[PDB]
Amino acid sequence: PVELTIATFNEFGYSDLYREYEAAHPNVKITERRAATVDEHIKNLETNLASGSGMADIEAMEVSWIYKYLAKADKFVDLRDHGADELKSRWLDWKVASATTSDGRIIGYGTDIGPEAICYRRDLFARAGLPTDRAEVAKLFPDWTSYFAAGRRFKAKMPNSAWFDSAVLTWEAMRNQLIQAYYSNQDRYLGDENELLKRTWDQIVAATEDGLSAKLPAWSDAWTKAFRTDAFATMACPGWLLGVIADNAGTFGKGKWDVADVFPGGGGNWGGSYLTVPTQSTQPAEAAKLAAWLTAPEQQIKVFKKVGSFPSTVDAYESEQVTAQVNPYFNNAPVGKIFVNRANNVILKQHKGPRDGEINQVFTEALARVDEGKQSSSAAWKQALREADKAAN
């Protein structure tokens, strides 16, 4: 009798899968643990890892946190010791890489992803003289320069609308495409020596000066309400955000949204998670086996149909369950095929160092101050550099 605990957050969609696994493996008993919030899941992770007690046998980890635990990889099972090297080709290469240490240890098996497209307001595009067919819209945005140029064209015709919701979310989209952002591959902080980072900053700041930003902080009440207005015409759009947009825009948004099979710069990803196995586990082989099964293509397809999470396993993209998916709210867009393409065109080569999230926070706070008119661009950039140096310690 192998007893395994798995700690998840939000809705991984695994409830039926646990029943299936126990039916196939009658010696294994699975118990799921759910913290009340994602922040408390993280805090439990941090607290239990440091105390040496209390961790689940499988701990879920969102990709935006995993940088902190790559630096603590000694405390996690290297899944290569349990067959990861044979499984590697199951996943998109960039999904595997984000859970791989500098020295090659693999500490997580990838669950879902958030491959990004550009969603857009076809009613606002029409009124601005832009194309509205998603195949034509896709040709407008091969790179960020073209994206902002189209935004200025839009803005010149539409004084009461902005191009995108906030400078910060545009920053997130662009920064994560750079080959390096804050760190060298040896975890050396170089944010103040990276001219491409400043060029990214300059280009977004110039967009805000051109009126392209609605200045709405993501997930704020003002941002939520703005979906029922003409406040902004485009968003960088992971697959999972479509449902958020449709909920927030509601009946006001019916007939007004579409999604284009494009992402400026090639591809982008926002979100997705991993299953990890702490060395605290007394059943690392059974834990790794269950984690591998939960993230196998057949199971990622089941999760996709249950809760809509987009698979990170390339075999799932050969399934008609995925590729036939259409989104009626978004003008019947073929989102299954679109987001397969968007996932296949993600390239991640940026190393995330031990304090990547803390450093990024000072840059996005500074950019938000510029966006909101509270600080000039040059003063905010100098302040971000000062604070990032401290954050990097």
Topology, element by element:
Layout: E1 2-8, H1 15-24, E2 28-34, H2 38-51, E3 58-62, H3 66-70, H4 84-87, H5 93-98, E4 109-121, H6 122-127, H7 134-138, H8 144-157, H9 167-175, H10 195-209, H11 221-226, E5 234-238, H12 241-249, E6 257-260, E7 269-276, H13 284-294, H14 297-307, E8 310-311, H15 320-323, H16 335-344, H17 356-371, H18 377-392
Helix pairs in contact: 9-10, 9-17, 17-18
**Helical element count?**
18
Question: What is the general shape?
Answer: globular
Return the structural class.
Answer: alpha+beta
Would you count the extended β strands for me? Answer: 8
Q: How much of the residues is beta strand, in percent?
A: 5-15%
Order of helices and strands: EHEHEHHHEHHHHHHEHEEHHEHHHH
Largest sheet: 8 strands, mixed
Helix content: 40-55%
Radius of gyration: 22 Å
Number of structurally distinct domains = 1
Distance between the terminal alpha carbons, to the nearest Å? 47 Å
Organism: Kribbella flavida (strain DSM 17836 / JCM 10339 / NBRC 14399)
Disulfide bonds: 119-237
Keywords: Signal
Pfam families: SBP_bac_8
